[PDB]
Amino acid sequence: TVLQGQPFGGIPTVLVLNIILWVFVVLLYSFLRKAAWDYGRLALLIHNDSLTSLIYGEQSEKSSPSEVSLEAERRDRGFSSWFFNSLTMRDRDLINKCGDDARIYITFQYHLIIFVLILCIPSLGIILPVNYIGTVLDWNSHFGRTTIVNVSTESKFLWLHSLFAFLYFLINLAFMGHHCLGFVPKKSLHFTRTLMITYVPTEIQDPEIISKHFHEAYPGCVVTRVHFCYDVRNLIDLDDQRRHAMRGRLYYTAKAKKTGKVMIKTHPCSRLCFCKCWTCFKEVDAEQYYSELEEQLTDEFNAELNRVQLKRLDLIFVTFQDARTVRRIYDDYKYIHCGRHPKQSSVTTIVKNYHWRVAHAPHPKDIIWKHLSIRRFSWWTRFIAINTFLFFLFFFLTTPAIIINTIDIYNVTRPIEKLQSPIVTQFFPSVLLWAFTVTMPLLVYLSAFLEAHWTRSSQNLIIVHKCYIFLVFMVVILPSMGLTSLHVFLRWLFDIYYLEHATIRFQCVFLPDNGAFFINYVITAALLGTGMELMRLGSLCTYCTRLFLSKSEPERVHIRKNQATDFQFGREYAWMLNVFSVVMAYSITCPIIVPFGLLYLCMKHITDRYNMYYSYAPTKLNAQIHMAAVYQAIFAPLLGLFWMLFFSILRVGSLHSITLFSMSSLIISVVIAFSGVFLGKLRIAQRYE
């Protein structure tokens, strides 16, 4: 009696397909670097060529560089010189490239690679052999009796599975503790002499009033400076437009001085028509039009700056001489909502010190003057709305990855006629889900930019949190909660009716009747996605951006100024934590996803090390991102414990004593995760001053 269950799974077919994809993409890179010239290195050289003083250039001492950049970017030239004779690294190859941020990257990366290695010893040599010996399924089936389906209900081995899950959450906590023991994070919150104050009445146009209030409230306190904020979004836009016009004017002036006047067409649709008729599009001088537009933009910028003084916001900045009085101000002002009246002065009635909420002012570079205007308590209701919209869109978008698995026949009594083709049944949903996961962070970034929150530190934290949470949701739970579909509803009434069916039917998990979908996804995602990451996936973004506004030839030089894209650590941690979460979720269940998880980790390291040294422009990382990424890493096995609880309740029962360890660990695991989190904040507090 055979109706479903794919023998040997889709693993071999997707394996040959992804190795073909990998060799194809590596050949495509090589041919792009050999035929499209220095596409991926000239932009990097231009970006680091003193961008602070790139528009204007002066001949200084030793103008010709001493091959500092040439020495590094001259090793990988041959086609075969990409893998061997290239690392010689032994934990010291690239420490002095990006700073301490790159140092913590692989610090955690390895605390992962060796972590998944120490997982590959018992999860391949203990749980896999004892799950293979299960015989509740059919012997003839392969990859169906190697997963958690094969362990029988009436057996003392699901206890081993759950206990192993608990001890593996413990060992992951130990690994992350070893990682945290060597964080020694840089003190990002330097003792700032300037504070940020909100809700300040706009009628106090004199900073002397605020200075007098601070002096009277705090004896012995000196106010260095007082700063006020203004609506400068239009000012910023006008400045950007003027900068673009000025750069284009210089480019066209140089072109005119070199090869004479150049005639261009201002209309964007001129390039669309190949018509050479004079009446179709009027031709105007490039430099004259550029100068006129720049003059008009400068006049509008001057008018906006003149009107800026009238648009005073309620956010102010006060600078003090000593940070001790700043700490006193913060300690007095943090608990205002608790009913304590802070220190007052003679002009406090105008000041209204009971309204002010003062915290440590972020760095001005971290401060974006355009998006500090995003502050209201009409918040947290748009957030639920945008979150619901994104969740519904992602559900309706990932539904095809589930419905492509079709539905069994159950109509005629002769299933010998034909069966499903493994290619589109297994590889296609996997690659399609991979494409959706790859395109997800773009939409997540767009949503976060729409929200814009309060400060960019919180913005990056909410990115690295919400992108990860949506990804693990869409990749673990609802792809399986909706994969409980194809439910057997026929002569066999409930799940365990032996009426006209063998033990192949298992309502607990019958996703492709074995669970091969997720391992198929992880292997294809590994190989294809890191083939894309070798080509960096940012090339498609650049292509789309140029196709959006392909015009105004000096804009090509403008693009080349910022053609080199820096590291987007949010996306890379999103990928790593997504696959880590899915592996930890199905590690104990199906142990075949473990060695392929090792393959993903090792090959991801292989690609991003080369990216680090030759395609990832160095740039510092905020410590909060890593301090949250470790928290996601430790919280990931709660997904696996939740899946173990799910399998206890469905397959085993409710009051069965095992359902309770999964029931208990999930409780002990969450309480221990909270303990570890608040211990991490406590250690930060210790290593804060």
Side-chain angles (χ1 to χ4, degrees):
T1 319
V2 49
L3 257 182
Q4 269 319 281
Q6 186 94 73
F8 259 124
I11 313 302
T13 38
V14 76
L15 227 47
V16 317
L17 256 286
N18 58 55
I19 80 195
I20 288 159
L21 283 151
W22 194 55
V23 59
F24 217 51
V25 300
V26 85
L27 185 68
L28 280 153
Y29 213 59
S30 280
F31 210 49
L32 177 130
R33 230 202 52 79
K34 260 55 154 198
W37 324 133
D38 224 31
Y39 177 80
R41 297 164 160 190
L42 263 172
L44 262 303
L45 289 198
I46 286 162
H47 209 111
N48 56 62
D49 198 17
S50 313
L51 241 189
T52 325
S53 169
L54 183 123
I55 321 293
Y56 39 90
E58 259 58 49
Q59 286 102 283
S60 197
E61 39 164 60
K62 304 295 189 307
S63 288
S64 56
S66 47
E67 69 168 308
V68 182
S69 65
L70 302 180
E71 184 50 72
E73 206 70 53
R74 222 45 178 175
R75 288 215 310 229
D76 297 55
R77 184 252 166 218
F79 168 67
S80 188
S81 64
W82 234 259
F83 208 51
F84 305 117
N85 276 248
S86 38
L87 260 48
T88 61
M89 92 76 54
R90 69 223 191 261
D91 287 28
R92 175 242 216 182
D93 189 22
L94 74 180
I95 39 182
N96 39 4
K97 304 310 295 177
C98 201
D100 213 347
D101 66 317
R103 185 171 250 201
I104 323 299
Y105 186 58
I106 189 190
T107 59
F108 138 86
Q109 277 268 322
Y110 256 161
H111 276 307
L112 263 239
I113 281 187
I114 309 93
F115 154 95
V116 85
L117 190 43
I118 213 68
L119 168 93
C120 270
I121 295 185
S123 180
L124 281 293
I126 298 175
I127 74 171
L128 172 43
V130 305
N131 158 298
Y132 214 80
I133 201 139
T135 165
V136 63
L137 218 58
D138 39 356
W139 182 10
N140 295 349
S141 156
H142 279 49
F143 203 50
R145 73 177 246 283
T146 206
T147 180
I148 200 65
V149 166
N150 199 26
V151 296
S152 161
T153 48
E154 180 35 300
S155 286
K156 61 211 162 303
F157 286 7
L158 295 142
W159 267 295
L160 162 56
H161 279 294
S162 40
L163 166 68
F164 197 99
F166 183 34
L167 327 183
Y168 202 89
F169 172 97
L170 252 52
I171 191 182
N172 168 193
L173 181 48
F175 251 86
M176 291 335 307
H178 188 295
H179 187 290
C180 286
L181 279 196
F183 255 126
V184 55
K186 263 67 202 162
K187 263 152 48 212
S188 65
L189 184 64
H190 289 279
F191 278 104
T192 42
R193 290 180 179 144
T194 312
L195 280 164
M196 151 290 301
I197 317 183
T198 56
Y199 305 106
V200 186
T202 39
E203 301 89 13
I204 311 172
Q205 293 184 10
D206 190 15
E208 291 192 7
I209 302 173
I210 299 160
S211 189
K212 180 179 176 182
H213 161 69
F214 272 123
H215 191 70
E216 281 182 358
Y218 310 100
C221 175
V222 185
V223 176
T224 311
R225 279 181 177 124
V226 178
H227 182 65
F228 302 132
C229 299
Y230 307 101
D231 195 3
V232 292
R233 295 169 290 168
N234 306 0
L235 204 74
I236 284 167
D237 288 347
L238 285 167
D239 194 51
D240 188 57
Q241 288 171 64
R242 185 185 64 113
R243 282 174 191 215
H244 172 265
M246 150 55 222
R247 292 164 197 157
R249 193 181 72 100
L250 247 193
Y251 179 79
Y252 270 129
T253 304
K255 197 161 180 168
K257 282 182 179 185
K258 284 190 175 191
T259 59
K261 295 182 176 184
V262 186
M263 269 316 189
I264 67 159
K265 299 176 182 181
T266 58
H267 208 272
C269 305
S270 65
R271 281 198 172 175
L272 204 74
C273 189
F274 301 98
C275 42
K276 282 191 177 183
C277 198
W278 184 30
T279 61
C280 289
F281 291 106
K282 181 183 177 184
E283 289 187 7
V284 198
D285 199 335
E287 179 153 18
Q288 181 72 21
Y289 158 72
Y290 256 88
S291 306
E292 288 174 3
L293 177 60
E294 176 181 340
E295 187 175 6
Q296 290 169 10
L297 288 168
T298 306
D299 290 341
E300 280 201 20
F301 173 83
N302 287 334
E304 190 72 20
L305 185 66
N306 284 327
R307 203 175 62 241
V308 160
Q309 292 187 346
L310 303 175
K311 304 178 187 173
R312 180 172 180 242
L313 292 171
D314 65 335
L315 170 69
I316 74 172
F317 281 96
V318 190
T319 306
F320 301 94
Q321 188 176 12
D322 290 322
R324 286 180 286 191
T325 319
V326 161
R327 181 169 179 171
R328 183 182 299 160
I329 289 178
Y330 189 72
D331 275 339
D332 201 44
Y333 272 65
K334 190 181 175 190
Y335 324 95
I336 301 208
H337 309 286
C338 298
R340 191 177 183 154
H341 293 294
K343 282 186 180 185
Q344 41 76 43
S345 77
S346 65
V347 293
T348 290
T349 50
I350 310 170
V351 158
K352 302 177 185 172
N353 65 341
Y354 55 102
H355 275 117
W356 287 3
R357 265 285 318 196
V358 181
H360 279 288
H363 197 274
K365 294 186 178 182
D366 187 54
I367 295 167
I368 300 178
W369 312 99
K370 195 175 180 163
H371 310 107
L372 293 195
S373 308
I374 307 311
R375 27 187 281 261
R376 266 291 77 201
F377 213 134
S378 182
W379 214 86
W380 205 70
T381 165
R382 286 156 87 262
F383 185 82
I384 198 60
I386 190 49
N387 195 87
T388 305
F389 166 65
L390 224 66
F391 176 87
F392 274 12
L393 173 57
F394 281 2
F395 185 48
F396 272 108
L397 191 153
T398 200
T399 314
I402 308 144
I403 79 189
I404 196 52
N405 299 23
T406 77
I407 298 101
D408 73 89
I409 39 184
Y410 68 81
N411 38 76
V412 86
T413 86
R414 321 188 155 147
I416 299 88
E417 316 155 329
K418 40 167 181 273
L419 317 173
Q420 40 86 20
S421 53
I423 166 69
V424 287
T425 317
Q426 294 288 339
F427 152 77
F428 224 67
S430 299
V431 65
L432 175 35
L433 183 58
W434 161 85
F436 291 156
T437 56
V438 161
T439 203
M440 152 172 321
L442 196 35
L443 322 164
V444 175
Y445 263 65
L446 188 48
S447 91
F449 274 136
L450 242 190
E451 270 275 19
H453 288 60
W454 307 93
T455 88
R456 279 332 81 69
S457 34
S458 50
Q459 174 94 70
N460 263 29
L461 218 68
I462 200 61
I463 275 277
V464 75
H465 282 316
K466 143 159 112 154
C467 157
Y468 162 61
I469 211 59
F470 266 141
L471 183 32
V472 47
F473 223 88
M474 301 315 78
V475 86
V476 173
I477 48 174
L478 68 70
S480 37
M481 246 183 64
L483 212 29
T484 206
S485 286
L486 297 95
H487 31 262
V488 278
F489 260 100
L490 216 39
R491 162 86 203 169
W492 38 101
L493 252 67
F494 59 75
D495 309 343
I496 329 289
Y497 250 109
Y498 209 67
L499 282 176
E500 262 281 344
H501 261 205
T503 44
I504 44 154
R505 154 201 40 81
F506 271 147
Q507 172 92 359
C508 48
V509 295
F510 58 113
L511 331 173
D513 306 85
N514 320 297
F517 169 53
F518 286 118
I519 165 67
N520 231 294
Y521 150 73
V522 77
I523 178 65
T524 188
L527 247 200
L528 202 33
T530 53
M532 282 331 84
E533 289 301 313
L534 215 165
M535 95 87 64
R536 215 180 154 283
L537 182 80
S539 45
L540 303 318
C541 163
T542 55
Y543 294 155
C544 285
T545 316
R546 313 321 141 199
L547 264 300
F548 284 165
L549 51 152
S550 62
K551 59 204 149 50
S552 154
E553 303 103 328
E555 213 147 14
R556 304 272 148 76
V557 194
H558 144 66
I559 289 152
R560 290 258 280 167
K561 141 182 169 174
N562 316 108
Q563 253 292 110
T565 307
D566 297 78
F567 202 125
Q568 300 245 37
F569 280 93
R571 212 176 314 201
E572 247 272 358
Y573 287 79
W575 307 136
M576 162 65 48
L577 269 309
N578 154 16
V579 159
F580 176 66
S581 36
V582 71
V583 170
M584 259 329 318
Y586 269 13
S587 45
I588 313 312
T589 74
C590 38
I592 305 311
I593 83 164
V594 201
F596 289 155
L598 188 31
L599 174 140
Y600 172 61
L601 263 68
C602 162
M603 160 226 86
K604 172 71 117 168
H605 184 202
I606 281 160
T607 173
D608 49 356
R609 152 66 188 67
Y610 160 80
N611 267 326
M612 279 330 170
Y613 224 114
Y614 307 107
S615 89
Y616 273 171
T619 291
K620 318 201 173 178
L621 165 90
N622 201 350
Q624 295 337 300
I625 284 316
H626 226 312
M627 278 329 207
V630 188
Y631 288 179
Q632 330 276 267
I634 173 60
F635 255 82
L638 289 76
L639 270 310
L641 256 301
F642 201 101
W643 254 103
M644 270 317 197
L645 244 189
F646 195 173
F647 278 166
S648 324
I649 278 76
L650 320 196
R651 171 181 225 123
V652 176
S654 204
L655 59 174
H656 207 312
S657 90
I658 200 180
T659 76
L660 281 343
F661 178 17
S662 58
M663 176 53 68
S664 301
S665 39
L666 206 12
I667 290 160
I668 289 153
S669 311
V670 82
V671 82
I672 286 325
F674 271 60
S675 72
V677 159
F678 100 97
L679 174 137
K681 341 307 293 301
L682 200 131
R683 196 36 164 168
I684 278 300
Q686 311 314 101
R687 277 184 325 194
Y688 220 50
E689 181 256 310

